[PDB]
Amino acid sequence: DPFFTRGRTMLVKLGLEKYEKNFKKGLLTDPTLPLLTDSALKDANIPPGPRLMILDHIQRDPEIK
């Protein structure tokens, strides 16, 4: 939970809260957020639209280290 708090915040902001399970399953912990790639999110079973929204968020939000 505490290792996933910032990721949960991003998903809530994107309207993608359903994929928090996918982040946990993939061990997409908060240190991974600045490093996410399309390949990693696809391996976590996130569909194309949500991947685009997540990747754009991490490239734009200065909240993501």
Residue numbers in the entry: 193 to 257
Give the authors' words.
Named Tric1 and Tric2 (tRNA import component 1 and tRNA import component 2), these almost identical proteins belong to the preprotein and amino acid transporters (PRAT) family of proteins but are distinct from other PRATs in that they also contain a C-terminal SAM (sterile-alpha-motif) domain. The mitochondrial outer membrane proteins, Tric1 and Tric2, contain a C-terminal SAM domain that is required for the efficient uptake of tRNA into plant mitochondria. In Arabidopsis Tric1 and Tric2 SAM domains have been shown to bind tRNAala via key lysine residues at positions 205 and 210 and are required for tRNA import into the mitochondria in vivo. The protein adopts a characteristic fold consisting of a 5-alpha-helical bundle.
The wildtype (WT) SAM domain structure was determined by MAD phasing from a selenomethionine mutant; the protein chain has three methionine residues including the first methionine in the N terminal Histidine tag however only the methionine residues from the SAM domain (Met202 and Met 245) were used for phasing. The final structural model was refined to 1.48 Å resolution. The asymmetric unit of the crystal for the WT structure contains three monomers with identical contacts between the three protein chains. Specifically, the side chain of Asp235 of one subunit makes hydrogen bond contacts to the side chains of Lys234 and Arg243 of the adjacent subunit. Additionally, the main chain carbonyl atom of Gly218 of one subunit makes a hydrogen bond contact with the main chain nitrogen atom of Gly241 of the adjacent subunit. Further analysis of the crystal lattice revealed a helical superstructure, similar to other SAM domains. This superhelix consists of six monomers per turn with a pitch of 28 Å. Besides the lateral interactions, intermolecular hydrogen bond interactions between the side chain nitrogen atom of Lys217 of one monomer and the main chain oxygen atoms of Ile250, Asp253 and Ile256 at the C-terminus of the domain on a neighboring symmetry related monomer parallel to the helical axis further strengthen the superstructure formed in the crystal lattice. Pure SAM domain eluted from the column as two main species, an oligomer at a retention volume of ∼58 ml, and a further peak at a retention volume of ∼90 ml, representing the monomeric SAM domain. Interestingly, both the heated and unheated oligomeric samples appeared on the blot at approximately 50 kDa, a higher molecular weight than would be expected for the monomer (∼11 kDa). This suggests that WT SAM domain forms a highly thermally stable oligomeric form in solution.
